[PDB]
Amino acid sequence: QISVRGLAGVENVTELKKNFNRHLHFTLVKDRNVATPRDYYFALAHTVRDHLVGRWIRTQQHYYEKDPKRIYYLSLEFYMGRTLQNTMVNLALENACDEATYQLGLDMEELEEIEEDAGLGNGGLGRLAACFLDSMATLGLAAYGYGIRYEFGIFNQKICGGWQMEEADDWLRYGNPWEKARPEFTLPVHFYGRVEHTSQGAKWVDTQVVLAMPYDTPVPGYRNNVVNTMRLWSAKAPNDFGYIQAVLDRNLAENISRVLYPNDNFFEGKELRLKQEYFVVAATLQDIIRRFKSSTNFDAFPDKVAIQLNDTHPSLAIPELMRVLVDLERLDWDKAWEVTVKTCAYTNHTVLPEALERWPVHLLETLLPRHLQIIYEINQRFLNRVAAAFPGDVDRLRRMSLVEEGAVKRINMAHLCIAGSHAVNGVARIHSEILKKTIFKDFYELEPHKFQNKTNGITPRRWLVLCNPGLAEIIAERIGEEYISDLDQLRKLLSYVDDEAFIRDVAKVKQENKLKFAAYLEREYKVHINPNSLFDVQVKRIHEYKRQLLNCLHVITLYNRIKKEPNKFVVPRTVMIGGKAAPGYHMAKMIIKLITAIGDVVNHDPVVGDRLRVIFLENYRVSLAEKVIPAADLSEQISTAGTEASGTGNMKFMLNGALTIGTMDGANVEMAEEAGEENFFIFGMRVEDVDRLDQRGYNAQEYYDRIPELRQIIEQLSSGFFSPKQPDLFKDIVNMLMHHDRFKVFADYEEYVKCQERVSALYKNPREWTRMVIRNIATSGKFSSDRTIAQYAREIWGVEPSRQRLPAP
Template sequence: MSKPLSDHDRRKQISVRGLAGIENVSDLKQNFNRHLHFTLVKDRNVATKRDYYFALANTVRDHLIGRWIRTQQYYYEKDPKRVYYISLEFYMGRTLQNTMVNLGLENACDEAMYQLGLEMEELEDMEEDAGLGNGGLGRLAACFLDSMASLGLAAYGYGIRYEFGIFNQKIVNGWQVEEADDWLRYGNPWEKARPEYMRPVHFYGRTEHHPDGVKWVDTQFFEGKELRLKQEYFVVSATLQDIIRRFKVSKFGSREIARTDFSKLPDKVAIQLNDTHPAMAIPELMRVLVDEEKLNWETAWDICVRTCAYTNHTVLPEALERWPVELFAHLLPRHLEIVYEINRRHLERVAAKYPGDVDRLRRMSLIEEGGQKRINMAHLCIVGSHAVNGVAQIHSDILKATVYDFYEMEPHKFQNKTNGITPRRWLVMCNPGLAEVIAERIGEDFIRDLDQLRNLIKFVNDEAFIRDIAKVKQENKMKFAVHLEEHYKVKINPNSMFDVQVKRIHEYKRQLLNCLHIITYYNRIKKDPNKQWTPRTIMIGGKAAPGYHTAKMIIRLITAIGEVVNNDPVVGDRLKVIFLENYRVTLAEKGIPAADLSEQISTAGTEASGTGNMKFMLNGALTIGTMDGANVEMAEEAGEENLFIFGMRVDDVEALDKRGYHAEEYYNRLPELKQAIDQIAGGFFSPKQPDLFKEIVNMLMHHDRFKVFADYEDYIKCQEKVNALYKNPKEWTKKVIYNIAGCGKFSSDRTIAQYAREIWGVEPTLEKIPAPDDKH
């Protein structure tokens, strides 16, 4: 039997067209040895694997640097409009392999390392994840950067280089334990400090009003670990100073002069606010224009609104930022004055349009009155931006309804930009076997134009294609099973259905609904052990925010269920439950290609978009989900019959809210649900601590905002359909093909092209920066 191709061998057969050609292997070896000697000051006698990783990373970085410098020179000469994407999170993961794939260097680097007697995958494993985010918002920002570069936009991502990334999650006795993620302890070869551009960032102090303007005095520099508001203002202040510096440097012929006409700022600068975290960009830009550049308020405000745009990522009340006025007054006194002035003028416009509507003024104010005055940052973003977008069609519609007063007053501002993922990382890099099978049928151009996946539909009945797709999935499952057995000491049945739910642990994402299905399925197997059950390996992964007690209890429940199920000899390998410890980008790249079933089961109306759902779809997993977030559009693109859709729709949830949700009705009516809840409450899964999960049961029974019980019955029935289809591999794989073929819409290249044309006023160029003449 022939040995399956490794992932690296697969990627060798797939090139990313239009990027750098394969470099001379001997040149790469020479540069690798040069970096080992002169950058790391080591030779092969004393070098470690980490030294070899750094030598290779620096060798690959050389190719980036040449392109980077020529790109900067090109933009300096052409002076295009520039896009500045501000995000408090950029969840980048690892960089080495992704860069090699994007530059078309992986083949040559792999061969060079082989000739040097080194194993490429071992070197890649030495890289730390850059975990500068905690979920979809941060990973979306990383995908967007990839697409901005791929589409040839003059675009920059601005964020914080956190000294510590999101915590490393350890599971100790079933509980989440947080450890510091010291991702910089060995250095980071992918960054270059620019101390020559250092700028002061001010806090505290007071304001002085003079005839010639307002001055913010007696301020302090940012130092150490500060509150979230400090972080948010820090990134905004530093970013805007850099934006203004770039704007002022203008080139006329051979001369460099200072551009002073700020009326041209919206023609040369687009600022995108990734959620409300960078909302301080609006009052900060006003402060710079009014206090420092001495523009009048009306002119400055027009410039500000035409420059800024805002992406909303959630309508959950607890996730919307509201800062106490008292804190603002202490930390950023000048900005509080500016926010009050923005609000005064805004409410004047509202009052003029809707005279006498005092309640509307209250609803639309940037300042929320009550026990504690708070600034509503979402309102600030809406008022101070020319475009406001949600991140999936259903979410954008819900957003309009949630802030209907603002939508009614300025409907032209509101848009939808359905999220996407980069196919370079989330297909070519992480699943080269699948990319190869696709390329054999439709060519390689789909990597840059994911809509071409639609051409796969004509192969949906092709026996050879069906076999090839199924074979790649099985190879990915075998590889991941080995990884799981090494790390979790649980014997995995690679022929079982890999049923995966990976995302932040949160009540609205309803890992608890998944738990109830696991318990129900376990009870059914125990009741009738001789039946031909569809075997499942159920994997749940994600991190709970350190202060989110309920989320931590959900993790403990998952691990407790696993302890019982995995050690029950009656069940055997027909059901296994694994909590994926320390879920992060690198683990996602291993697990997503191996998944058969993707769980996207949030309460309808709560998930803004999701991007994990898109990654699973692109990698050949079928989705069981509610009509929430981007699931709606996935069903449109692939055909609803090719997803497992269950549960309440948004209208059903709203109707249930009106008549009242009473969990005990479902508990009393559904015997399997009652049995599962009674087992959790009675200590079946926690015999040493029978009351361990009483809080979870109490929440589900009496104050569950996300209505787990209301969708339980339909979810269980839908899972029965999943089991039945999985027993028919050919029909299952046909649905997989329809899903992959429907993924074209969910490329971040499409998303960014829409942002560029419809919000930023720039056109994706895709033109190539001339390749450097010098050889590295």
């Protein structure tokens, strides 16, 4: 059908059809008479999977032959989403398969919707890991993703009575055709026990043993025949351990890989979480060292191994590597430490204090007694370095300590990571500067060479070609297909900004995507959106710092203005807000309810009509993002300046033809800088303004007293206008906004609504709104994760990316 989807050869289609029938029969043990749509999806999934194996086997064999430096990306989260379509895209099998299934009388798109999302992530952090894997395979890096195989991923969100309800995400229920169990590579992981000091070294004894069984999932590069591996560990009880009760208690050791903690940017200090963190680290390092010993002086270890810590979650890799090198391999401390620092790199994702991992000492003490001793030794030698560099600065010593004194002693994992890594990076220019100027200023002054920046990116394969083929096609029609793996080329589209044919095409694609989504909204969930309105969307995890509340205030404002002047013309808008709240995050759950409560009033007001609709997108996840984003006109990125480290959803929207309304926060700053401030809807306080407000003190009352419209909104909320049967349902929200708003929603209210008026004004001029859209898409090249990864490879890992096709399949 469309160019970018590959050729549908005569031989290829014929071969696909027979292998499809082969799997339906031999693999699924079914025949055309009793097969259900799910059986067809599996037949197709196995057929596509067959095309990967050859490449997967020789890619791994290749690395064994040439023995290049290996990159190990440790993360407790990999937000993969679906993999069928992505695999077809990267293998150029999409049209062949579409055609082959067509001839077999099946709609391929209908079959793809059957695939369960691999939601092993919460949000930004987890998705970045996923985009990174794709880019590393595309750039020919010998990389491995390591994590935990949760049998229950992020919970599926249900809205009942306007409230969020959580239900287990049993994504493995029907099976996963992409993973390959490797029980022959099972490794033992130790917990508890105690430390014995013998003649020659310390020993960790009397430990509880849990087995780590690996599951490999192929990660195909874009049309280069490279297939890397994502290895996910599963917890298994040793056969060692009433008889019946003993057998049933095995489900105590295996609970370690049972479920993903659903916290986005929040630290919950539960023991089960620490176990997961150590579990993934202990098993991974053994696998790493084993693979290394094959390639025993570890001086070359850093030249053959790079370990990237995606946040502090896998920070125990630092003391664990030291433990193995010192306790088992018997290297002297200093040598081991040099080695550790040279192979580890740490990526910071947020500056919010409630997100920082600070593990109580009594916990590490009981669970990992040997690691605690190593941590104290590391801390001891590190503070000696600080004291020698800043004699007499005793306060600096307690501020930089890995050990935090107070109510209960805690270990600051972020300080541990900085000390044991040769590189520390932020995820956006502004975020990285903030790290050097505030949160980690003492560390920066001590070792300025460690601090770097690596602005985040998204993969153009899943985030353009896969979810927006229509847009990918009209672009390719003009500049070719080369941009798919070199997004910078999108700049060439800048010379089509005045091209009347292109203007019409870009706008036509957006309209088709909106009709497509508007339909999906009725087919599933039976809604009533009007395709002609401006699609105003904000999708991301529910957070006070993300300020979904600032969006709500604008929605209520728009509503009150319509009711005030009913017969005045206003640009039609469908505001869509979606996202999950962490189960124990009360304020976030109240916000979801407020959103649906506003929709209950606004959507049933006869005077409003189809001029304003408020929809809450249920169960926002990766596969839902692939549908909404391509259909969006306005992208809401309105976090308080200085809180959103980078953000990545913002990039997805810019690449798919939506204009952006936001604050100068995270990557928003670099995006506006690339597209030009005139092509961006910027508003609100900058980082400096927030600081000046804090010096003086933030008093929400002041804004409530001076802005009539804001006052009316707060009064409607307190009087029960949006909750008739429950007059004070939103007392917590009002109370928070008025007395303890850490994110100063009111401070940005006035500039936000005025900026929204500028958006409605531009929308009334179709031609100009589209030319601005083109200006955005054309300058989004910098935000490709290929660029991000190439910088990591060159400035942190010491490896050169390659675009060379691997010697065929």
